[PDB]
Amino acid sequence: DPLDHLADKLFHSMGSDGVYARTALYESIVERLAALITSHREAGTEALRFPPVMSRAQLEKSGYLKSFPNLLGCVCGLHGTEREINAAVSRFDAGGDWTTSLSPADLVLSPAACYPVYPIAASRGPLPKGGLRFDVAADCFRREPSKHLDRLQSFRMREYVCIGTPDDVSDFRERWMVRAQAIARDLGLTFRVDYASDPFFGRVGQMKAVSQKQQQLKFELLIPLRSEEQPTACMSFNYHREHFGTTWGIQDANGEPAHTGCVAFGMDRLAVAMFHTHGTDLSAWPAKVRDILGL
């Protein structure tokens, strides 16, 4: 695979496909990418930082199980009595399976950074005119093991979320689609923006994806890493309509169920795209790219 040569400089094996330790070099570029994104934040944008876990009930309510039940990572633990837990440990000692004593917690590993923001916003009452804007981030998890450096199970996502009337949201995504390309261009990156769909699970879900592409609810900034026929989505631009407004009972300033949308940056994909394009020697990066990043 075309990205495999970047591994030695960027990553250390942690014994599981899609889960890597990050070198100082790699993390320095993720950090500069994050600062660059921050510097383009719209005014009036509330910034929240989420942990890698979130409420299972909140995610269930958000419909994630209808869409991607095969990607969800759930948090489980030994919740029994001391005797039960000791027996579990005993089976382990004997070289057997202690994991049969596991049961679900009330937590999942967050599959996307924006999910926890909707209930938070909803607890505030009706939206002001012009809706609300959030800057969110989280380490996310998706259960899709791969050896490819651009398909991870654990990865940083960064999002700007807009909640408001349909105009606030559409205008928001319009601004960001343009702005994101200007950013990619200043990063010396090769890309195009195209209609996409989320990978909905099952045959039913295959049709949801078709209707999603047809309604143009999802765009991706696509970057040729391994091949130009098979480029990698490093950003997405998402229109959710009233889905979250309805679910969480968020009202826009006109009494109506709020629309929501988000602009998502795959921090690790962007960082890998940067190293693939410009190499692992920062002193050699183009002057304009070094400048844009504040190197």
């Binding site: 039913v204 049709m207 949801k208 078709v210 209707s211 999603q212 047809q214 309604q215």
Partner: peptide, 22 residues
Amino acid sequence: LVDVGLTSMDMVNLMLGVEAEF
């Protein structure tokens, strides 16, 4: 078919009617 007004749930319920008729 989308200019008509068919949303995702509308399209899902549409795949269901076609798989049903034949």
